[PDB]
Amino acid sequence: XXXXXXXXXXXXXXXXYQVLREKAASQRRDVERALTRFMAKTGETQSLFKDD
Amino acid sequence: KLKLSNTVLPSESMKVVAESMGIAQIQEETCQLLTDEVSYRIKEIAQDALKFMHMGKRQKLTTSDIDYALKLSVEQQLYYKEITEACVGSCEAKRAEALQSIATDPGLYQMLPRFSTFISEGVRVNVVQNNLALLIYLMRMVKALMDNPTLYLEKYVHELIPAVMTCIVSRQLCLRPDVDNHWALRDFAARLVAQICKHFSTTTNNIQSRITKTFTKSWVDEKTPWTTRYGSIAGLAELGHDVIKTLILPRLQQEGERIRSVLDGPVLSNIDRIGADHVQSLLLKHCAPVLAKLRPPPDNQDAYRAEFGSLGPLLCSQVVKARAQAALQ
Amino acid sequence: XXXXXXXXXXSVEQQLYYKEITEACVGSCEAKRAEALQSIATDPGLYQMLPRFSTFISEGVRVNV
Numbered sequence: 001x002x003x004x005x006x007x008x009x010x011x012x013x014x015x016x017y018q019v020l021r022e023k024a025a026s027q028r029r030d031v032e033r034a035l036t037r038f039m040a041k042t043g044e045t046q047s048l049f050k051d052d
Numbered sequence: 053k054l055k056l057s058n059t060v061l062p063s064e065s066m067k068v069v070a071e072s073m074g075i076a077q078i079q080e081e082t083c084q085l086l087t088d089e090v091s092y093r094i095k096e097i098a099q100d101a102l103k104f105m106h107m108g109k110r111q112k113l114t115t116s117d118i119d120y121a122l123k124l125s126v127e128q129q130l131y132y133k134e135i136t137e138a139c140v141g142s143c144e145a146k147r148a149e150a151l152q153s154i155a156t157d158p159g160l161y162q163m164l165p166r167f168s169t170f171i172s173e174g175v176r177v178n179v180v181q182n183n184l185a186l187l188i189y190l191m192r193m194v195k196a197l198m199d200n201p202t203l204y205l206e207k208y209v210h211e212l213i214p215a216v217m218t219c220i221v222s223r224q225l226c227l228r229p230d231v232d233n234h235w236a237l238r239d240f241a242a243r244l245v246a247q248i249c250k251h252f253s254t255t256t257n258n259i260q261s262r263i264t265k266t267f268t269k270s271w272v273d274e275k276t277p278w279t280t281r282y283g284s285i286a287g288l289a290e291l292g293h294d295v296i297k298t299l300i301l302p303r304l305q306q307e308g309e310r311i312r313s314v315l316d317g318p319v320l321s322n323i324d325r326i327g328a329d330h331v332q333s334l335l336l337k338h339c340a341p342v343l344a345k346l347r348p349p350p351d352n353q354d355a356y357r358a359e360f361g362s363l364g365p366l367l368c369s370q371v372v373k374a375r376a377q378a379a380l381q
Numbered sequence: 382x383x384x385x386x387x388x389x390x391x392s393v394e395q396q397l398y399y400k401e402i403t404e405a406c407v408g409s410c411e412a413k414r415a416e417a418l419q420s421i422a423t424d425p426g427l428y429q430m431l432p433r434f435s436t437f438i439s440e441g442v443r444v445n446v
Contacts, residue, residue, distance in 0.1 A: 026159065027159050027161075028125075028127070030157070030158055030159035030160065031127050031128065031131055031159075031160070031163075034131060034153065034157055034160055035127060035131045035134070037153060037156075038131075038134065038135065038149070038150065038153050039134070041149045042134075042138075042146050042149060
């Protein structure tokens, strides 16, 4: 079969349930902290310590 | 466009009204012609009363008018919103802070497809609009996309590469003067090109071949404006060492004669004049070191003879400068 | 508008053939070694289990350097 016949490649299952929703929720946390850092250094800023 | 049929009352009901007085047995066509004639008189008196009240100047007909006529999620697009708005607005600290944001993002993707799509179509817009500030904004945006050590940029690169290289095109359609150097600043963008290909010629090997054929068809021909030739030379320049050694060396002298024809003849295409001038700047102050490696550093005037005069001896002078820069360590 | 999922250059058959090639390159039995060597040197028209093959062959070269 290694020369004559052929096959088909789908190649991406990735269906690991808890791992999937870990990916999604971790990404949501990322976008949270990203926009936080952005408007953090963007707008009027007051701190918790001095100069953070 | 309009059809005014005769509004004819049904003759059987007219025979009912007639035989209420008890006349006779009546045929149909008599009552039909009676309804016709009475309808003509009604519509004529109606035309008369409409002429009255369009000289009485009201669009309504009262009883008295005809009586006188009887005198006969969320945060995805939130983040997207403010980072695009900072990408467009010139708040310069917020500009640079957005750039360091994108550069320092753990796990910013899935915004990446919309991101790049915006980059592509805003590039097309500002090609039509010729706003260099937005162009360097988008190029810094691409630079920031490049500098994530998380962003597997791979699958989307096919949108960036037009959006890159079209910025190395446009048909000289800005204002002239300073934009030339801004064309040089677009060569900054050309730096990005090499900073693409080092990470992305990993293909079933496609990318470098593609871009270099593109620059080749750019570089060779005539009917080629100075934007095109200049930026193509810039992209090959950013591709580096043996690109220049193999590819720019051959028709070096012929395009030098093209500039020599731009030299010494007419005057008032100063777009084209200063264009070819900082073309010469690109050629000399990027193409010196490969000859400094190859051609041994005697014989400056002969190197001018070996490389069509004009680059020499500033070729050899810059070669002396480059040998000094090498020996400076 | 989500595009159809991709398909590699390989077949499943010939990528498993490729896996046989690789683990015979590992191969302790020198019969399997020479079988691999002949299979390399005399599979013309293969051409498509080219570079990916050779590419992280070279990457394995670096890692084992």
